[PDB]
Amino acid sequence: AKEGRLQEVIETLLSLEKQTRTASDMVSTSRILVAVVKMCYEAKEWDLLNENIMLLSKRRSQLKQAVAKMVQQCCTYVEEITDLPIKLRLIDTLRMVTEGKIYVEIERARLTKTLATI
Amino acid sequence: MAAAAVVEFQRAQSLLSTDREASIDILHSIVKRDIQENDEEAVQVKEQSILELGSLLAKTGQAAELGGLLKYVRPFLNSISKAKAARLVRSLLDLFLDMEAATGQEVELCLECIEWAKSEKRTFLRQALEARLVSLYFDTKRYQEALHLGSQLLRELKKMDDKALLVEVQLLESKTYHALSNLPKARAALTSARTTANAIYCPPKLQATLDMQSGIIHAAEEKDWKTAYSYFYEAFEGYDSIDSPKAITSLKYMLLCKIMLNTP
Amino acid sequence: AEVKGVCTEAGMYALRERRVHVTQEDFEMAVAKVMQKDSEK
Amino acid sequence: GFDRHITIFSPEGRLYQVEYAFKAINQGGLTSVAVRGKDCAVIVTQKKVPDKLLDSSTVTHLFKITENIGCVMTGMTADSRSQVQRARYEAANWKYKYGYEIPVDMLCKRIADISQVYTQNAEMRPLGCCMILIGIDEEQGPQVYKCDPAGYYCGFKATAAGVKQTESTSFLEKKVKKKFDWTFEQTVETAITCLSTVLSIDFKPSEIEVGVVTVENPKFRILTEAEIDAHLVALAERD
Amino acid sequence: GADREVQRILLELLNQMDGFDQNVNVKVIMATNRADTLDPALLRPGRLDRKIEFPLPDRRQKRLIFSTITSKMNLSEEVDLEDYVARPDKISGADINSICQESGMLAVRENRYIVLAKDFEKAYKTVIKKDEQEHEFYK
Amino acid sequence: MAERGYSFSLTTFSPSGKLVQIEYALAAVAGGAPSVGIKAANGVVLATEKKQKSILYDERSVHKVEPITKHIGLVYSGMGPDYRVLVHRARKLAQQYYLVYQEPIPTAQLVQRVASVMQEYTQSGGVRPFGVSLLICGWNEGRPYLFQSDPSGAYFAWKATAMGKNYVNGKTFLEKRYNEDLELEDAIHTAILTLKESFEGQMTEDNIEVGICNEAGFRRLTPTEVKDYLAAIA
Amino acid sequence: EGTSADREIQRTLMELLNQMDGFDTLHRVKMIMATNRPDTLDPALLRPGRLDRKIHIDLPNEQARLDILKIHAGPITKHGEIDYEAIVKLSDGFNGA
Amino acid sequence: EVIELPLTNPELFQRVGIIPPKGCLLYGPPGTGKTLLARAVASQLDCNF
């Protein structure tokens, strides 16, 4: 997209993920992680986004907890309108909602709850 | 059709699942195509043809067709090496008998096959085909025909290679006896089977069948349902593990024994 | 000594079946069990 | 049995003395690894010194046996150096007599026979060394053959040397499923990586000594710093 | 070192056996871990006849054990049960039991609520190791 | 020294009247991977097992069957390096003697030469005998074939035999199953079965090496060819 | 197979196994063992449910070695300049003590 | 990781359903000083020795 996968967002994504590491937790801080994730959503539309969210999931990118918060908000925003049947695809693709690792966590439980509602 | 064996083979595999039986069948004519006397290329296309024909075979009932093909490939295969000849022929035959088929028709093919196997001189391969016969014959109710062949066979297996077969010849033999209805002989046949069986590890199913037949004697003729139930359970377990239809019949028997004992 | 064993085994099958008197099928079966021990080296 | 001044057949099934050669074959801390591709065959070694009153421009453990053939040696220094000299003469002679190039494999088999006799003598011991032969044949392509001084030699898909061989083997197997998917340099990179994990040392420009055999050349060359640093930099980018 | 102090103890066991077991109602069961130095007349019949020794496991036996434990870790279609069976060389029953308890312990630390192939292989090695280059047979 | 050392042998007469070193070599033999031989009369079958133990290998590199001549072949049980060396000296002797003459090799004469080299080492010291046992397999005309050679220095004729681990047990299996007229294809089926019974770690078309002597002597089987037989009866 | 002093060896060993063999469960009870050379372990210890974990010594890396030297040097008195790395080089095969 | 974690939660182990550790062994050359390695540990765990 114009500045989505060819300027601010993408360049910033590559430098951070190197800084953060997938082999470590927090060395950056969560703020940059959240900011990138909220910006990428704003940057692009529904068809582009789904491919992008899955990519990010490949890499660890901080705490189990940190990632879970970021994924949860994005699910919340996609929950509307015609955007709802494409959402079904995304939530299924990511495993941390049909799967636990640390599952005394409320955010994951909610996202499952929602899937049942669908 | 296509201009190559490779392209045609791939396209054919998908046709049965997508459209229907008729489309995959037309491609199988590689069998009556690119024939030689050398048979370097011709054998390679036959190996592909056996698998494609099996895929087709249950739905079509092409049992009759298969028969023409089985004879037809035979002098071709002999040519390149005896071992492949032996292998394609045996492999096809196993495929054939799985399906619903006429016994008479099958028995002619197996019968010619025995002669084919002598020609080169195989007691390894010949012994195996003779086994298949005892199983086909019993169903047709040529019980008498089964008894003699089995007696001759029991002597051959004993002395020669491969130890495992011997138990099967003994299992088929007791079945022969059961239908004739003279009870002691059958009780005695199974005991022999248990002896051989214990020596090496044998699957649950082989053993389980023996126990159904021990069971047949106990409930239906010695009326000792308590004991018969114990045999049926074991048999029931052996069948469950590898999945067989036999389990439902064993399940009937396990219920019946309780009713006879007079306990709802 | 190993003949004695054949007799001891024979009793076990019959007991398990809850029979009063031991028969030829069992007695043979026992011989068979002891014959397998002899077969192995 | 009596190892004391003779060596005999024993119920042990091996010899205490043969095991002892297997066991201590390094008295330093070098480790080595070799991988085979169809693009290269690479051996990765170390450079280490105890002081700097010593030179390092003649110190090496990679030998150029001949143009086509290369040999890295794991063994006692005295024994490694001797064997090379013996080999150098035998190869040359094979070239003279036959008029044709000596196969890599052929040398390993010939040398093996010389080892074996010494195993029969109770008046002389076998040399203590494991010899890894690497080369580029035009008759099966590149070839990687390891010898051990029991008289055993075999060709492998890749192998490792030093005292931590088994540990290196575990990485190797994972890797060895896919290795024909590596291009030229990317072979080299992975090769660096598996020694760095075992040994637990992120290398430095004067600690490493990569030797590569190159297909479509009869070259065995030890790589220049610029190329060696280019790789090292390359793994940083994936970290 | 001694054979007297223990002697009176040993006599008494013989006395008791003889005192009863004609209106049998009490069983006697023995366990040993160094049965290389029993008494000859600890074995004289009319005192002991069955000796049951521990065996190697069957392929099918290993499987059963594996089927029971996995139920607890929570299955996946990622893992295959079969590979776990295929990997062994048919070692003793203690060893097969040993690994199954261990695999669960690795998994919790890795923070998982499912199951992964890799921890079984780490766990598998931990018990198995000792291996060294040997054999001149064909080495 | 360069001529000093042990002039007399390590092996020595005992008040037992046995030869210690010799006794040990039966053990040395024992350790070998499973071997068999079947004589198909018109044919000959020899078979063995390649154990495998490192996934890291190449091709089917070294064998355990090497052709001495175009008519006789050896396979063995015992120590591998010894085998390579044993083959080289003999191989040299077979060609030189039977190119003086143009007659083709008689079987017994090879046996006589292998045994002598084995025996001289028993006579002399400094060097120890080899600790291998060989199966000399050949074909020629209507002659008998299939012969066995000991690290002892002794030879015997056989119709069938087995080597390697659990040699006595396998031979007892072999004894019962092997009788009368058989076929070259048939003999192969049996040998695989007898090897499987001795031990199977697995069998693939690369755990097995089978070679035969039949049409025009020794011929090496393709990997596919053997695999056809595995399917022909597993 | 004495019972000289050796009967006591058997007495203690048997006790260790008896606790495990029991209906006791080390419910929150932790065990740490120290052994100089391992070769006298029982066949019941290989199985967990007594000695679960057996950890080895590990010989320090040069970066560990630097750290250890550094923490030692630090309390005590010194000049103003020490090349730490040079000493790291000479040193190998030691533990912190 | 072995010792300390069971003390903090059995609960985490419990959900999975897995038996936790009882004993741990340290062996080798007493280059640390046998007793020193252990003693250093005792301090960290801060429990009833």
Side-chain angles (χ1 to χ4, degrees):
Chain A
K2 192 197 67 53
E3 54 188 5
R5 326 176 53 138
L6 294 164
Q7 188 182 142
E8 298 169 22
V9 189
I10 190 73
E11 281 304 276
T12 207
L13 272 174
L14 292 173
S15 304
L16 174 54
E17 287 164 64
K18 197 176 172 61
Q19 204 187 286
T20 301
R21 312 176 72 193
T22 187
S24 301
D25 278 301
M26 185 185 306
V27 45
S28 305
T29 175
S30 314
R31 291 193 177 80
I32 182 162
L33 182 60
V34 64
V36 293
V37 168
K38 180 65 170 61
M39 188 57 190
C40 63
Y41 194 96
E42 297 196 290
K44 57 204 56 77
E45 300 314 302
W46 321 141
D47 57 286
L48 304 169
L49 194 70
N50 218 95
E51 324 169 52
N52 293 57
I53 310 300
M54 180 171 60
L55 298 173
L56 279 169
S57 290
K58 299 189 163 55
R59 38 278 179 163
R60 183 183 186 176
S61 305
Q62 325 185 322
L63 303 182
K64 279 297 187 58
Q65 215 61 59
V67 173
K69 193 171 34 73
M70 285 26 153
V71 293
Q72 156 60 250
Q73 284 163 262
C74 286
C75 304
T76 310
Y77 304 153
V78 179
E79 185 176 340
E80 35 185 348
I81 207 162
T82 183
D83 303 337
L84 273 171
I86 57 174
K87 190 179 77 188
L88 185 55
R89 291 80 209 214
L90 193 275
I91 54 176
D92 270 68
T93 302
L94 51 94
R95 286 187 55 81
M96 204 65 62
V97 67
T98 48
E99 197 185 63
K101 302 290 167 66
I102 305 170
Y103 218 72
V104 292
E105 294 184 11
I106 41 149
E107 299 169 306
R108 308 189 165 170
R110 295 193 296 177
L111 297 177
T112 317
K113 172 49 160 67
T114 308
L115 187 156
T117 305
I118 299 288
Chain B
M1 311 195 180
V6 61
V7 200
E8 186 190 312
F9 196 54
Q10 286 175 66
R11 177 163 72 242
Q13 188 73 318
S14 310
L15 282 167
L16 189 54
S17 171
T18 50
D19 300 297
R20 57 200 93 271
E21 317 164 70
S23 283
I24 173 196
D25 192 4
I26 293 292
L27 304 185
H28 194 72
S29 290
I30 194 84
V31 290
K32 311 184 171 52
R33 253 172 310 134
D34 302 286
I35 48 170
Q36 301 191 323
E37 296 309 285
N38 288 134
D39 301 332
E40 311 288 57
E41 302 301 284
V43 178
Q44 307 174 17
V45 304
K46 290 179 187 64
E47 305 178 293
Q48 295 164 252
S49 314
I50 306 321
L51 305 169
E52 198 187 340
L53 176 68
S55 323
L56 183 59
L57 182 66
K59 206 183 196 190
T60 52
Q62 264 173 235
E65 303 197 37
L66 185 142
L69 313 168
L70 178 63
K71 280 169 190 50
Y72 160 83
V73 302
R74 207 246 165 175
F76 289 80
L77 251 297
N78 308 156
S79 314
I80 179 183
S81 21
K82 294 166 53 173
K84 298 172 171 76
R87 173 184 61 85
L88 221 78
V89 167
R90 188 51 187 190
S91 287
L92 190 53
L93 247 289
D94 301 306
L95 304 167
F96 186 59
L97 56 82
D98 284 341
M99 313 302 182
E100 247 196 273
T103 178
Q105 183 165 222
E106 191 190 306
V107 165
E108 181 165 5
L109 302 176
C110 289
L111 191 59
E112 288 160 320
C113 201
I114 291 167
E115 306 307 82
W116 288 346
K118 296 196 159 173
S119 309
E120 310 309 303
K121 186 177 72 200
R122 287 116 168 191
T123 199
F124 264 84
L125 195 61
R126 180 165 70 212
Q127 200 171 83
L129 293 158
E130 297 173 285
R132 284 300 189 170
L133 286 178
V134 198
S135 294
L136 300 169
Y137 293 175
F138 180 67
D139 301 314
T140 310
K141 290 296 192 305
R142 295 181 297 187
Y143 36 88
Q144 5 57 225
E145 197 172 44
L147 182 48
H148 70 86
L149 199 63
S151 290
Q152 288 167 242
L153 266 170
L154 199 75
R155 302 293 91 236
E156 183 168 57
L157 270 61
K158 193 65 188 67
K159 288 163 190 68
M160 299 307 293
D161 302 291
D162 315 290
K163 302 183 292 304
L165 309 170
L166 185 266
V167 189
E168 315 183 69
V169 165
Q170 281 284 330
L171 169 76
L172 268 300
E173 216 72 57
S174 316
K175 294 207 175 300
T176 323
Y177 303 155
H178 184 50
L180 307 158
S181 198
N182 208 241
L183 311 167
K185 324 187 70 178
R187 177 63 177 271
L190 304 168
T191 302
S192 297
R194 288 185 285 199
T195 305
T196 51
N198 273 95
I200 50 164
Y201 185 53
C202 295
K205 183 175 68 58
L206 173 54
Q207 299 185 23
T209 320
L210 312 177
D211 290 306
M212 175 75 87
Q213 300 171 105
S214 311
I216 293 296
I217 315 178
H218 288 62
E221 310 297 319
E222 307 196 57
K223 311 182 169 62
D224 291 334
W225 285 289
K226 194 295 220 182
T227 65
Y229 172 45
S230 300
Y231 304 128
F232 301 124
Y233 192 94
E234 292 180 282
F236 177 61
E237 192 172 305
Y239 310 139
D240 298 328
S241 316
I242 179 171
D243 282 311
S244 282
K246 291 179 300 278
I248 305 300
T249 312
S250 308
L251 195 265
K252 276 190 301 176
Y253 297 164
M254 269 169 59
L255 317 183
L256 193 70
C257 284
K258 311 300 191 166
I259 302 274
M260 299 339 288
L261 279 175
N262 308 280
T263 168
Chain C
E2 307 288 282
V3 179
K4 310 181 156 65
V6 174
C7 306
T8 335
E9 306 194 73
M12 301 307 287
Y13 311 123
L15 279 165
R16 196 187 298 190
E17 279 193 326
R18 305 185 191 231
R19 306 298 181 222
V20 297
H21 294 293
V22 194
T23 199
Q24 57 311 291
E25 188 269 296
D26 296 32
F27 197 53
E28 288 178 66
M29 180 161 174
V31 160
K33 286 294 167 268
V34 176
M35 283 176 69
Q36 287 182 84
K37 308 179 185 52
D38 293 314
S39 303
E40 61 179 81
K41 279 183 165 70
Chain D
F2 305 94
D3 43 19
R4 303 279 84 178
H5 50 96
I6 39 177
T7 168
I8 40 178
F9 283 136
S10 306
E12 183 191 336
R14 44 221 176 271
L15 287 157
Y16 302 122
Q17 307 187 213
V18 177
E19 290 180 293
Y20 285 153
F22 292 166
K23 281 161 186 298
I25 205 169
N26 287 92
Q27 292 100 60
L30 300 164
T31 43
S32 317
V33 62
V35 284
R36 159 183 69 120
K38 62 193 203 294
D39 280 313
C40 40
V42 305
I43 53 182
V44 178
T45 55
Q46 279 311 270
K47 299 162 78 52
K48 293 179 178 173
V49 286
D51 284 94
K52 319 177 296 309
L53 52 95
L54 185 73
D55 184 52
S56 286
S57 292
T58 191
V59 177
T60 194
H61 323 89
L62 293 208
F63 285 93
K64 307 207 178 279
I65 182 180
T66 178
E67 177 181 291
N68 194 254
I69 319 177
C71 290
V72 55
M73 306 307 260
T74 304
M76 277 187 186
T77 309
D79 293 316
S80 296
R81 285 212 291 254
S82 63
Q83 183 284 329
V84 179
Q85 287 272 70
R86 289 191 153 147
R88 267 181 169 181
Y89 244 121
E90 207 277 318
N93 187 231
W94 208 111
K95 192 51 170 175
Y96 170 73
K97 197 146 161 196
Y98 292 100
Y100 164 59
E101 184 39 41
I102 327 93
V104 177
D105 56 285
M106 194 56 169
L107 215 78
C108 192
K109 191 166 171 170
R110 275 207 173 222
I111 286 309
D113 302 301
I114 86 179
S115 314
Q116 205 277 331
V117 296
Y118 320 146
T119 324
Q120 298 179 261
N121 298 294
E123 301 307 301
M124 190 188 170
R125 51 171 299 246
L127 274 49
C129 192
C130 301
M131 189 190 199
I132 300 83
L133 284 120
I134 53 170
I136 169 56
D137 318 75
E138 311 295 308
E139 286 68 57
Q140 254 278 139
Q143 196 47 240
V144 293
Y145 252 88
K146 166 180 178 188
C147 190
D148 301 273
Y152 195 58
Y153 43 114
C154 267
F156 264 48
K157 309 172 188 188
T159 192
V163 294
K164 307 187 68 60
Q165 303 169 140
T166 302
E167 286 76 272
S168 191
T169 300
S170 323
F171 294 104
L172 283 189
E173 190 286 328
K174 298 292 184 284
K175 291 183 179 60
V176 95
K177 293 317 277 96
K178 290 187 77 71
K179 72 184 196 70
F180 62 84
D181 299 278
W182 314 323
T183 55
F184 283 104
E185 295 293 279
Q186 190 167 70
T187 300
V188 189
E189 212 194 321
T190 47
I192 296 167
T193 310
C194 49
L195 208 58
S196 295
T197 307
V198 176
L199 192 76
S200 306
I201 306 296
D202 295 291
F203 292 125
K204 161 204 183 70
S206 210
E207 288 196 334
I208 185 177
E209 186 167 66
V210 184
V212 301
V213 162
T214 45
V215 301
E216 282 61 77
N217 284 292
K219 295 286 76 55
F220 176 37
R221 56 177 292 203
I222 303 195
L223 304 185
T224 177
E225 276 273 60
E227 301 185 307
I228 286 167
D229 289 359
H231 295 289
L232 277 189
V233 165
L235 272 159
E237 203 176 61
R238 309 165 180 236
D239 210 41
Chain E
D3 54 4
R4 302 295 167 182
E5 320 304 332
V6 309
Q7 192 180 315
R8 35 261 192 175
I9 326 187
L10 184 69
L11 283 163
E12 299 160 356
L13 309 172
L14 327 178
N15 291 358
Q16 190 192 140
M17 282 288 241
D18 281 294
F20 193 44
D21 314 68
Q22 289 295 351
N23 309 292
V24 89
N25 210 28
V26 183
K27 287 291 153 285
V28 193
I29 302 185
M30 296 87 162
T32 46
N33 311 276
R34 198 73 41 70
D36 301 287
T37 175
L38 306 166
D39 273 86
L42 173 61
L43 301 137
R44 182 177 176 169
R47 206 163 308 300
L48 176 47
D49 50 351
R50 299 286 171 275
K51 302 84 28 177
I52 304 303
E53 271 58 51
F54 194 58
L56 275 290
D58 192 61
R59 220 57 174 182
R60 174 176 180 260
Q61 292 192 302
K62 302 166 180 57
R63 192 154 63 222
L64 313 187
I65 294 158
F66 299 155
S67 193
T68 314
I69 191 49
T70 47
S71 291
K72 310 176 191 55
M73 313 176 110
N74 294 66
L75 297 296
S76 61
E77 286 173 307
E78 179 193 40
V79 287
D80 303 301
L81 188 60
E82 198 54 56
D83 159 71
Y84 310 145
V85 214
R87 298 178 300 130
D89 288 69
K90 328 166 62 37
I91 56 186
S92 311
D95 289 309
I96 306 281
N97 301 346
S98 176
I99 59 170
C100 300
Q101 293 168 121
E102 181 62 290
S103 287
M105 299 177 176
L106 296 168
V108 175
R109 306 167 183 152
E110 291 179 281
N111 294 108
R112 199 178 180 97
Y113 199 5
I114 307 288
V115 72
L116 191 51
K118 197 181 191 287
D119 66 86
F120 284 80
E121 171 179 291
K122 306 192 276 280
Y124 172 107
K125 297 295 189 202
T126 313
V127 162
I128 213 65
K129 55 200 190 83
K130 53 198 162 65
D131 291 48
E132 178 188 301
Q133 60 182 336
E134 301 185 299
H135 301 56
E136 301 306 294
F137 299 94
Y138 26 72
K139 181 165 191 298
Chain F
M1 54 171 178
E3 75 298 342
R4 300 195 178 192
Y6 204 0
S7 65
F8 296 85
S9 315
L10 310 168
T11 328
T12 56
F13 295 93
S14 303
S16 296
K18 295 303 177 309
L19 302 171
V20 61
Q21 290 266 263
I22 303 292
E23 299 300 281
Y24 280 132
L26 309 183
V29 164
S35 194
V36 57
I38 304 286
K39 185 178 54 73
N42 43 283
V44 177
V45 179
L46 50 299
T48 197
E49 197 157 64
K50 311 202 59 172
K51 297 294 298 159
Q52 280 67 256
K53 47 141 279 202
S54 53
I55 313 169
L56 303 169
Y57 181 40
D58 284 323
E59 324 162 68
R60 312 197 190 305
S61 291
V62 284
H63 295 316
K64 285 179 176 166
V65 185
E66 291 295 300
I68 301 283
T69 50
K70 323 106 204 297
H71 299 273
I72 304 183
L74 288 189
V75 70
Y76 68 115
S77 290
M79 301 271 199
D82 302 353
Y83 176 70
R84 304 301 167 194
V85 159
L86 190 70
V87 169
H88 183 283
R89 319 183 187 249
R91 174 156 56 94
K92 179 176 190 192
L93 287 156
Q95 296 165 23
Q96 65 78 20
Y97 198 94
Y98 288 95
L99 288 165
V100 170
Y101 295 111
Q102 299 302 315
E103 92 191 70
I105 186 154
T107 46
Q109 300 305 116
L110 185 94
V111 178
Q112 158 275 117
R113 293 176 294 201
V114 296
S116 295
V117 179
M118 281 276 206
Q119 187 40 237
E120 287 189 69
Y121 296 149
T122 327
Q123 301 175 310
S124 296
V127 292
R128 205 169 64 189
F130 297 141
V132 67
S133 49
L134 308 304
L135 303 181
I136 308 95
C137 299
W139 187 80
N140 266 332
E141 297 172 70
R143 299 181 164 146
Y145 305 122
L146 197 48
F147 314 103
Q148 193 291 321
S149 273
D150 279 294
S152 314
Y155 60 88
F156 297 92
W158 292 92
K159 294 187 152 279
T161 197
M163 318 182 141
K165 301 173 198 74
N166 303 103
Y167 61 97
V168 193
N169 305 101
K171 214 177 164 172
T172 312
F173 295 121
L174 188 51
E175 182 171 325
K176 304 176 286 183
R177 62 190 75 253
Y178 179 72
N179 283 276
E180 221 74 78
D181 287 15
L182 283 168
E183 210 280 298
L184 192 265
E185 274 192 283
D186 290 1
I188 297 165
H189 319 320
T190 309
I192 302 161
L193 187 74
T194 307
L195 287 170
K196 190 208 76 34
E197 203 70 59
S198 285
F199 190 44
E200 178 167 75
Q202 247 290 122
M203 287 291 188
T204 56
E205 49 183 305
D206 182 40
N207 293 112
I208 298 195
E209 189 163 48
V210 171
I212 69 294
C213 299
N214 190 5
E215 193 48 73
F218 190 82
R219 297 176 78 177
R220 185 69 52 136
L221 284 164
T222 313
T224 194
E225 287 200 294
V226 183
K227 184 55 63 183
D228 299 326
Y229 291 137
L230 281 171
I233 164 64
Chain G
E1 316 298 301
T3 42
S4 289
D6 306 290
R7 28 188 171 214
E8 306 182 28
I9 300 175
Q10 283 311 122
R11 200 166 63 209
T12 41
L13 170 56
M14 157 70 154
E15 208 58 18
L16 184 273
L17 305 168
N18 285 357
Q19 265 76 260
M20 301 310 156
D21 293 359
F23 297 151
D24 293 317
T25 29
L26 274 85
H27 194 284
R28 284 282 303 203
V29 181
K30 282 311 184 183
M31 163 204 333
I32 294 179
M33 288 190 161
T35 295
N36 291 277
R37 295 144 293 218
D39 69 309
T40 55
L41 289 68
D42 199 76
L45 311 189
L46 190 149
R47 201 194 154 222
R50 40 257 78 199
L51 281 164
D52 294 70
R53 287 294 310 113
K54 311 177 179 61
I55 73 86
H56 36 76
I57 190 188
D58 297 291
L59 204 289
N61 192 228
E62 306 319 272
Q63 303 310 293
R65 177 171 321 287
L66 173 64
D67 183 32
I68 303 158
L69 276 149
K70 278 188 312 74
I71 56 166
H72 296 153
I76 69 177
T77 53
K78 66 191 71 156
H79 167 61
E81 207 288 290
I82 307 164
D83 174 356
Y84 299 105
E85 178 181 278
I87 325 169
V88 168
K89 308 307 199 54
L90 296 173
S91 288
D92 211 274
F94 290 143
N95 290 88
Chain H
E1 291 167 334
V2 182
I3 290 155
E4 182 180 38
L5 260 62
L7 299 187
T8 323
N9 266 149
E11 275 71 73
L12 285 161
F13 295 89
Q14 261 161 217
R15 288 154 75 250
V16 186
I18 180 66
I19 185 62
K22 297 180 175 191
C24 187
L25 176 56
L26 153 60
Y27 66 94
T32 64
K34 186 69 46 54
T35 312
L36 308 188
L37 213 170
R39 271 209 300 173
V41 175
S43 319
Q44 182 70 60
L45 291 168
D46 292 282
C47 205
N48 296 295
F49 292 92

